[PDB]
Structures are given as structure tokens and as C-alpha cells.
């Protein structure tokens, strides 16, 4: 099937900026490439069709250009409404194929995370279940690392990570790595610490809870 | 032109789903109704399309024999029925109008989706409806400032995804970070909502969270207090 | 006054003052395997033409038709 690859997988940029998103086709699709925008929890919306044509009611800021295999989307004046995943979908072949999508973020000042460790609640500890949640709060570069060291032993393969979408006012991010350990291995240790490695942090910040 | 699809559907491995897509304001015949599924945090995948005028349905090779697309001009409603549902079929399903361009040979489809419908989510799992277990997040051992006021509630072991957590019934909006849900091997989901309020502001205001898992009608409010 | 319009491709009462039916024909990429993209409709002036556009304008009713 015609394979289409949008190159700017993620592209952070300020509202006072102009952004261009690339989509490459495996086959010459000529002027048959449509452009769409998907905001979270919302269905895609067609911005540009037939490569350059713009649908009725689409901010002129949105301009599209290209032919053959290489195409470009120009968002012109970024407005907060214009920050979302954008998709390129050819119209040349029966197997209609889409690009992976490019997420437009808000370039903000580098902000360091606020690290917090939450010990297992006794109500949960009654059951064999024991969960330890670590919270990084308001960090700008989303790229962040979390380690889980118990009694100074790195703990890999026992934690799951969930990240919040960029905040509205702060334009920052928040992360939560919850380690899952049976009541047994829990009471079988003393130190429970969370390491945090981030761009804004000069030194790794490792908080700790010693209750065993 | 508007497209109004079915509601969410929870289905088991091997089961079959049929999703409604209702077209309004536009000529249903002169148009074509395709379908495109979006797996969680994934891209969009064309599943197939049906041009009523021709009555024929063009299906992708993948989904050939499992997808059956139908149209009822009477109700101007279009239907996508996927069978042999697998876990990986857990995704949002969208219905989209495709304009038709008239060439000399015959009316052909223009691969532009001018209109898209409110998505329908089909969640395929071998799990059954389970209510969540709200567990509280205690502070940073009454810290001086390394704690500020980071408190929260843990929503764990809840199966039908929709789950809504709020603080002080809407009084606490600033500083609230309800996280995205994460699926565990158990086949159940876990979520956490953590609020960064003022440190000194702790007994002054009682901080309680409000869980609403309507699938199992479990509305639980648990107090969050230091130690 | 009553000619054919492409997108719905039905006999659509042509609007007041408009008594034409342009059968605009031109070739796109797939002109090779499909044929000239056909375009019918209404007008009050035989529409203008581009190097590859060709247009036959009826003046009677339902005479802006498409080959099978």
C-alpha cells in the first residue's frame, strides 16, 4: 500500500511562530494528498484537500503545498486553537493511507519537575496489593526519566508511567510512575526511593520513603 | 452535513460489533460513507467504504472477510460490522463522508473525508465490569516545602474505561492533575488524580476526591488527610 | 432553466436568470484510466475555459447530460 511518513513526529513551537509539517509518499501520488487536524478526544477535521485547496471555513493560516511524493503544511500564525496532531492522507490509491501524525506542542521555558513519593495506603496493603506512586509536576521538556530504587536496588519491569497533556495556563507537563509490588516483597524491603532525571534538573533529584 | 454514530460498546473476544453512522443535511446517495478506526494513542486506519449508488463496498485486504459495511437509504444510516473481535480491535471507530467526483467512465470517489462523525469506541476485553478501589495519596511526611501540598487519590482495578475524578465537587480546579488511565495485565485500569494546593493550607480546607465509574455506578468520595 | 448539476448529478432547477448547462471536460492525472473529469450545472454565460477545459452549453431543459 502507498506508505506515507510525516517527518516532524513532534514539533514544539510558540504562538508567535510559523510551522511547516512534512509528509513523504512511497509512490508519486501527484496532487492527491489531504491534510487533517485531530485534537484530543475529537474526530479528525479536513484542513486542506487536493494538496493546496482549503476547505470552506478553514483558517487561511492553514496553507498546503507539494506534489509527487513530498508535501508540506504551513500553519502560518500559530494560535492556541491550532495546536494538535495533524495527519496526511493520500487519495491516489484504494488503500487510503495516513501519516503517523505530528503533535504541535507549545515551546515554553525549561521547567524542573517537582518530585513527590506516595506510600502504599493501609487499605490497599490489607490486600496483597501495594502501589507506590511518584509524581513529577509542571516540567516543560516532556522527555523525562524515572528510576525506582528499593534498598538501593534499581527496580525495572515493575512500574507503569502515565503523562498528562500539556497544561492550559502553565503549558507544562506532569508524569506519574506507579510501582506495583506484592505486600510480600514490600514488607521484605526498607527503602523505597524514586529517581528523576530531567533537562531542567542539573543534578538527579532522588526522593525517598523509609518505612519498609 | 453531520454524522452521528452509535454509543460506546464493550465486547468480548470472538464477539461481533455493529456501529451506526447517521448522515444528515446532505445527499446520502451522491456521497460515499467510509470507516476508519483509531487505536488508542495510534494513527488512523481506513477499514472500508460503501458507495450506495453502486451498492458495492470496497474493503481493505486486512479486514477482508471480517468487516461488512452496509447502508440503508431509508434511514440514511450506514453500518460497519466487525466480527471475530480481538483485543487489538480495541479502538475508536469513525465514519466519514467521502465526496464523489464524476469522471467520464463513471462517478468515482475522491479520497477526501469532508465530514467525520463523533467517534464510537469499541473496547474488546475478556474482563467484566468491575468498580474501582479509591486509595488515598498521603503528603511528603509533613515536609517543610519539599511537600507544598501534593495530595491525591488512586483509582485502581476498574474495568470499563470511562472514570471521572474531581476535587471538592469542582471547588478545586487549579492544581488538579487527573492522569490518563493505564491498563494492567489484570485487564483492569488504574488512574491517579493529584492536587498541588498550599502546604500551610491543609486542615483549613478538607480535600476530598469524587470518583464516578458509571459503568458500575460506583460514586466514591474519600477524604485525603496528612498521615 | 432546469438542467443537470454534477455533485448530486440530478436535474436541478437551474436558478433564476441562469439558463445554461456547462459540460466542462478536462483531464487530470487519472484521465489516463478514467477519462475527462465531467462537470455539468447551470450558468447565465457559457462559462470560461482553460487550455485543457472544454465545455458544451445546452439552453433547453435536462440537456446537460453525462455519457453512460
CB contact under 8 A, B107 and C7: no
Residues facing B176 on adjacent strands = B195
Q: How far is CA B43 from CA A89, B39, B49, B89, B92, in A?
A: 11, 7, 18, 14, 11
B94 min Cα distance to partner chain A (Å): 7
H-helix or E-strand containing A187?
helix A183-187
CA atoms of A74 and A20, how far apart (whole Å): 5
Query: What CATH number did the domain enclosing B114 receive?
Result: 2.60.40.10
Residue A207 to chain B, least CA–CA distance (Å): 9
- Cβ–Cβ < 8 Å for A121, A178: no
Q: How is chain A split among helix, strand and coil, in percent rounded to 5?
A: 5, 45, 50
Place of cell 498550599: B198
C-alpha cell at A168: 492550559
Residue B129 lies in a domain: no
CA distances to A26, A194, B40, C40 from C11, rounded to whole Å, are: 42, 72, 45, 10
For A34, residues 6+ apart whose C-beta sits below 8 A from its C-beta are A46, A48, A49, A50, A88, A89, A90, A91, B111, B112, B113
Cβ-Cβ contacts under 8 Å, A30 against chain C: 29
- Residues followed by a break in chain C (C to N exceeding 2.5 Å) are none
**Sequence-separated (6 or more) residues with CB below 8 Å from residue A74:** A18, A19, A20, A62, A63, A64, A65
Is B88 strand, coil or helix?
Answer: helix
Domain A116-210: CATH architecture, name and number where available: Sandwich (2.60)
- Domain count of the fold of chain B: 2
Q: Is residue B130 part of a domain?
A: no
PDB resolution in Å: 2.9
Write out the three cell numbers for A78: 500559530
Which experimental technique did the depositors report for determining this structure? X-ray
| Whether residues B96 and B143 fall in one domain | no
Which 11-40 residues of chain B touch chain A by CB within 8 A?
34, 36, 38
- Please name the residue that has the C-alpha cell 502507498: A2
Question: Would the CA dihedral through B118, B122, B123, B129 be positive or negative?
Answer: positive
Cα–Cα distance, B161 to A41 (Å, whole number): 14
- Cα angle B65, B66, B71; round to 5: 95
Is residue B175 situated within a structural domain? yes
Nearest to A92 by CA among A26, A20, A45, A5: A26
Look up the CATH superfamily of C1-59. CD59 (2.10.60.10)
Distance CA A173, CA A113 (A): 9
Closest CA–CA distance from residue A90 to any residue of chain C (Å): 14
Beta bridge pairs of residue B182? B190
Helices and strands (DSSP H and E) totals, chain C = 0, 4
Q: What's the angle, vertex CA A194, arms to CA A145 and CA B222, rounded to 5?
A: 110
Contact between A83 and B97 (Cβ < 8 Å): no
Q: Which residue of B has its CA nearest to A120?
A: B137
Question: For B65-111, where are the alpha helices, taking DSSP H only?
Answer: none
One domain, residues B88 and B159: no
How many whole angstroms from its chain centre is CA C50? Answer: 14
Mapped onto helix, strand or coil, the DSSP state of residue A148 is strand
Name the class of domain A4-105. mainly beta
CA distances from A54 to A35, A51, A62, B112 (A): 9, 9, 8, 12
Question: What cell was used for A20?
Answer: 511547516
Q: Are strands B120-124 and B9-11 parallel, antiparallel or unpaired?
A: parallel
Domain extent for B167: 135-224
A43 part of contact set with chain B, CB < 8 Å: yes
B143 and B183 together in one domain: yes
Give me the residue label for grid cell 486542506: A48
- CB nearest to A162's CB, from B113, B133, B180: B180
Q: Is B144 on the interface with A (CB under 8 A)?
A: no
Cβ within 8 Å, pair B192-A133:
yes
Amino acid at each position: 500500500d502507498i506508505q506515507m511518513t510525516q517527518s516532524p513526529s513532534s514539533l514544539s513551537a510558540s504562538v508567535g511562530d510559523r510551522v511547516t509539517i512534512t509528509c513523504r509518499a512511497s509512490q508519486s501520488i501527484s496532487s492527491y494528498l489531504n491534510w487533517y487536524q485531530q485534537k484530543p478526544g475529537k474526530a479528525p477535521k479536513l484542513l486542506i484537500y487536493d494538496a493546496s485547496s482549503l476547505q470552506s471555513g478553514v483558517p487561511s493560516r492553514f496553507s498546503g503545498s507539494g506534489s509527487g511524493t513530498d508535501f508540506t503544511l504551513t500553519i502560518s500564525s500559530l494560535q492556541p486553537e491550532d495546536f494538535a496532531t495533524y495527519y496526511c492522507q493520500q487519495s491516489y490509491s484504494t488503500p487510503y493511507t495516513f501519516g503517523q501524525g505530528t503533535k504541535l506542542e507549545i515551546k515554553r521555558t525549561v521547567a524542573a519537575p517537582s518530585v513527590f513519593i506516595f506510600p502504599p495506603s493501609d487499605e490497599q496493603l490489607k490486600s496483597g496489593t501495594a502501589s507506590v506512586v511518584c509524581l513529577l509536576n509542571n516540567f516543560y521538556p516532556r522527555e523525562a526519566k524515572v528510576q525506582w530504587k528499593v534498598d538501593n536496588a534499581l527496580q525495572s519491569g515493575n512500574s507503569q508511567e502515565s503523562v498528562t497533556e500539556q497544561d492550559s495556563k502553565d503549558s507544562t507537563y506532569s508524569l506519574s510512575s506507579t510501582l506495583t509490588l506484592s505486600k510480600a516483597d514490600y514488607e521484605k524491603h526498607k527503602v523505597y526511593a524514586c529517581e528523576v532525571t530531567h533537562q531542567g534538573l542539573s543534578s538527579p533529584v532522588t526522593k525517598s520513603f523509609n518505612r519498609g | 452535513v453531520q454524522l452521528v454514530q452509535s454509543g460506546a460498546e464493550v465486547k468480548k473476544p470472538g464477539s461481533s460489533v455493529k456501529v451506526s453512522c447517521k448522515a444528515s443535511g446532505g445527499t446520502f446517495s451522491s456521497y460515499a460513507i467510509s470507516w476508519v478506526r483509531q487505536a488508542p494513542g495510534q494513527g488512523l486506519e481506513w477499514m472500508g467504504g460503501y458507495i450506495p449508488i453502486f451498492g458495492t463496498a470496497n474493503y481493505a485486504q486486512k479486514f477482508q472477510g471480517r468487516v461488512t459495511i452496509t447502508a440503508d437509504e431509508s434511514t440514511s444510516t450506514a453500518y460497519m460490522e466487525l466480527s471475530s473481535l480481538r483485543s487489538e480491535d480495541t479502538a475508536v471507530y469513525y465514519c466519514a463522508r467521502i465526496p464523489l467526483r464524476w469522471y467520464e467512465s463513471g462517478p468515482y470517489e475522491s479520497g477526501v473525508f469532508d465530514y467525520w462523525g463523533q467517534g464510537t469506541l469499541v473496547t474488546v476485553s475478556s474482563a467484566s465490569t468491575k468498580g474501582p478501589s479509591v486509595f488515598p495519596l498521603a503528603p511528603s511526611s509533613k515536609s517543610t516545602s519539599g511537600g507544598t501540598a501534593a495530595l491525591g487519590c488512586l483509582v485502581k482495578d476498574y474495568f470499563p474505561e470511562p472514570v471521572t475524578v474531581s476535587w471538592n465537587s469542582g471547588a478545586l480546579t487549579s492544581g488538579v492533575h487527573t492522569f490518563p488511565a493505564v491498563l494492567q495485565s489484570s485487564g483492569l485500569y488504574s488512574l491517579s488524580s493529584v492536587v498541588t494546593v498550599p502546604s500551610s493550607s491543609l486542615g483549613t480546607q478538607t480535600y476530598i476526591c469524587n470518583v464516578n465509574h458509571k459503568p458500575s455506578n460506583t460514586k466514591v468520595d474519600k477524604k485525603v488527610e496528612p498521615k | 432553466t432546469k438542467c443537470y448539476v454534477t455533485p448530486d448529478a440530478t436535474s436541478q432547477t437551474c436558478p433564476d436568470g441562469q439558463d445554461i448547462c456547462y459540460t466542462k471536460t478536462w483531464c487530470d492525472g487519472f484521465c489516463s484510466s478514467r477519462g475527462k473529469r465531467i462537470d455539468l450545472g447551470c450558468a447565465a454565460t457559457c462559462p470560461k475555459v482553460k487550455p485543457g477545459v472544454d465545455i458544451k452549453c445546452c439552453s433547453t431543459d435536462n440537456c446537460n447530460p453525462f455519457p453512460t
